[PDB]
Design a binder for this molecule. Structure first.
Ligand code: 7TL
Ligand code: 7TL
Ligand code: 7TL
Ligand code: 7TL
Ligand code: 7TL
Ligand code: 7TL
Ligand code: CL
Ligand code: CL
Ligand code: CL
Lengths: 150, 142, 150, 142, 142, 142
């Protein structure tokens, strides 16, 4: 079975990989943000939306991963070979969940197409040589003849 | 945050806990069953249903957990540091995912009501003394 | 004072004793079952029914007994007198509470009249020589309303 | 399960805790009093009331507890260990049943509303400095 | 800034000081009483009244003070300085909070005017020579 | 009793905790600001608002806490014991009161809804990687 967690939400793992790790908040900051904005919906008996359902699982899975990793770290041989487990989370599964949690939280806040446009805008900005690009990053929340039809 | 994965699906962790561990298929057998019955839906770009959305994540999370567990296990050469890891998976996170995967797969197949009534029927059957109970278990499809 | 806990429910200690100890689930399994079927009612501010009131007290009383028995067991030095306390619970008060808890839970589920007729049916079945009786026990659910104002 | 015996009767464990231990009659005196006032109703085939149902179980439970404690207590040899059981009963489960038995007996006699306001009245009287408070306690019946 | 906690409630620190220390219940007994009478209002999302708001902060401030005093007491080497910390709380901030907690709880129960007249009534009674005064204190609820 | 000081003001301790410690002005700077903006109201015999009532108690509670801390500090001879007491308030109760004083002062100035939206705005901004976020923080007065 080849399941892409982003496919049902109009994205792909390959698209989220266009963003380097430095772009994403930490998991703990993503989790704290999910609580501050969406705790009541996330804890409710109502589906709310597919992003809500998915985000619920991602949060619980991270708990699963940390419980197992902590149990491994609390009973493994060298209290120096924990730096390896911590590093393995940071270099591998940590970035995956930063991508995933950021994706659902930001989609719930700004909508999929704003999220997907910002994904490419920032991924292009950060690949432009710093001496040739605008000093500040593009901004996620951003975006006459209104008078004619008054 | 205290999230119960079953709450949006009309159940609770405690209700699933009413079923003994011996009740559930293995994770591998649940995953192969999800593929045989629902692969095309699980792999499609359509949400399909909230159970589909949840099951997609549960399957992927298991991969995450096993990747971590195997990588830890393949870099241990003491089988007292190795069989312990397998035992921890079997007794702890393995049982959680057997409950979760069975719940979503069976709900997709039979409906929540049927699943919730069978949870109670079987949990009560198995707690009845074997000499006083029907020799065969109740049947989910009915 | 001579109080029979079953008398207000149209039964008697003697009638409940017609079932052998082998018939009843364990206390733990009756407690799990009461929670699985009736947790919300048992925890509510509503009486619900005399069976609910009784089952509430029975559950808490068992807690009292286990607390006392555990405190006694933690202050006994002989590890064979600790097993004697365990045996005293199982042979004496344990059977009493298995009878009582089963009675109230089954009555809430199937009704008093079904419960009492099953009591007699199973009690007669188990007393029939195994070579002369049906190979399987009778079944509670196969047997074929006061509002309690106050 | 978290069951509060007083909740279905419009009270709580913590509310009964507002009264000091010295406020309650002894278990024996409560048992004598239930017998003197309500023996016939308690022994009848009529439910009579939720308080009757509860009090029936509380009385029998105390019997269960005393049988166990007596069976334990009659099998020790050190008279400082025997008294240790007596102290543990008095400090713990004895106070719980004094609270419970008084509550149901007093409710049957005076009504829940009178009982609850007396719990508050006496609880406040006993917490007032003795040199500042009325020389006699408040009275349940009035 | 010179803030008197009683000023917005029609009283003053000097007026509460007219009652001797022995008049007031202990902080523990005031906290238990606030819970018994007003727990639901105090914990509710509704302001309810300025007394509710003030009492909410007073309770939490006492928690803060006890946390600090406990942390200080557990890190003092000299166990005679620890008892000194205990004495300083009882003689100083403990008395201030007995005044404050009593004031808000009694105002919620009997109203401001009854409380303030009782303050003067008891303050005058206790300053009358015991051989010349009525044997019993005046009564707040009358 | 479980009282959240923000609940009657439409917030919770958890929501205020979303802001890191370095977001908040110092207690002294908050107290100076309360004096410069609201001294006459805080000292007046009028309730003014629940925020006024709450802020009045918070200021006096900090006074209580500092009086206790100063009395302890003036009776410690070791200047490293005094620095630890100073450090403990800053790490602990100081942060609680910085949160509290800021919340009431900013609510009186800008309104609850602006304050709550700003807590989330700044809380999200500071969790965005500095190389990916706007160089300047969002502005409370918008
Ligand atoms: C809700 O309780 C029940 O449904 C019971 C049935 C439900 N039955 C369980 C079954 F035996 F498996 C068949 C089924 C039925 O009656 O159809 N049978 C019996 C008994 N039969 C013989 C001795 S006890 N007892 C209760 C019961 C069982 C297990 C438990 F943990 C708690 C309870 Cl209250
Ligand atoms: C779609 O899955 C099923 O149909 C299930 C059946 C279908 N039943 C299988 C059967 F037990 F063989 C009879 C049949 C039925 O209900 O008719 N029974 C049970 C359970 N029954 C008792 C404990 S679990 N669980 C699921 C299931 C079984 C195996 C598996 F690998 C994955 C799943 Cl989701
Ligand atoms: C709810 O508070 C009260 O009812 C008060 C009474 C009610 N009275 C208690 C009584 F003294 F017993 C008589 C009764 C009354 O006024 O009728 N009297 C007094 C005081 N009287 C003298 C000094 S303090 N204070 C309060 C009170 C008492 C105890 C406590 F723990 C907390 C409080 Cl707020
Ligand atoms: C039958 O119940 C009663 O009438 C009670 C009275 C009623 N009367 C007792 C009295 F104290 F003598 C006055 C009188 C009344 O209220 O008029 N007072 C009190 C209490 N008062 C203070 C602490 S407990 N408790 C119950 C009671 C008393 C003794 C006993 F063994 C069992 C019970 Cl349930
Ligand atoms: C609710 O989530 C957000 O509003 C996000 C913003 C909101 N923006 C934060 C800001 F950078 F400060 C500006 C603001 C805006 O878009 O106006 N920006 C970004 C990112 N920008 C660049 C890289 S990630 N990601 C999310 C976010 C940020 C922090 C966090 F802990 C969790 C999340 Cl989901
Ligand atoms: C009256 O209080 C204020 O106006 C506040 C401003 C007003 N702003 C101060 C400014 F940052 F300088 C710009 C201005 C504005 O919002 O327009 N900003 C902020 C904060 N912003 C980020 C973290 S705290 N907090 C309060 C405040 C500031 C200092 C102080 F001593 C006490 C208080 Cl209550
Ligand atoms: Cl009888
Ligand atoms: Cl004096
Ligand atoms: Cl609470």
């Amino acid at each position: 079975m080849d399941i892409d967690p982003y496919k049902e939400f109009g994205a792909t793992v390959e698209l989220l990989s266009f963003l380097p790790s430095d772009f994403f908040p930490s998991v703990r900051d993503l989790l704290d943000t999910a609580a501050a904005l969406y705790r009541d919906a996330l804890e409710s008996p109502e589906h709310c939306s597919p992003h809500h359902t998915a985000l619920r699982q991602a949060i619980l899975c991270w708990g699963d991963l940390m419980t197992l990793a902590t149990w491994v770290g609390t009973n493994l041989e060298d209290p120096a070979s924990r730096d390896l487990v911590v590093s393995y989370v940071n270099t591998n599964v940590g970035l995956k969940f930063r991508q995933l949690l950021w994706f659902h939280i930001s989609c719930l806040t700004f909508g999929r197409e704003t999220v997907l446009e910002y994904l490419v805008s920032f991924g292009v900005w950060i690949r432009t040589p710093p001496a040739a690009r605008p000093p500040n990053a593009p901004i996620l929340s951003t975006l006459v003849e209104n008078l004619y039809f008054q």
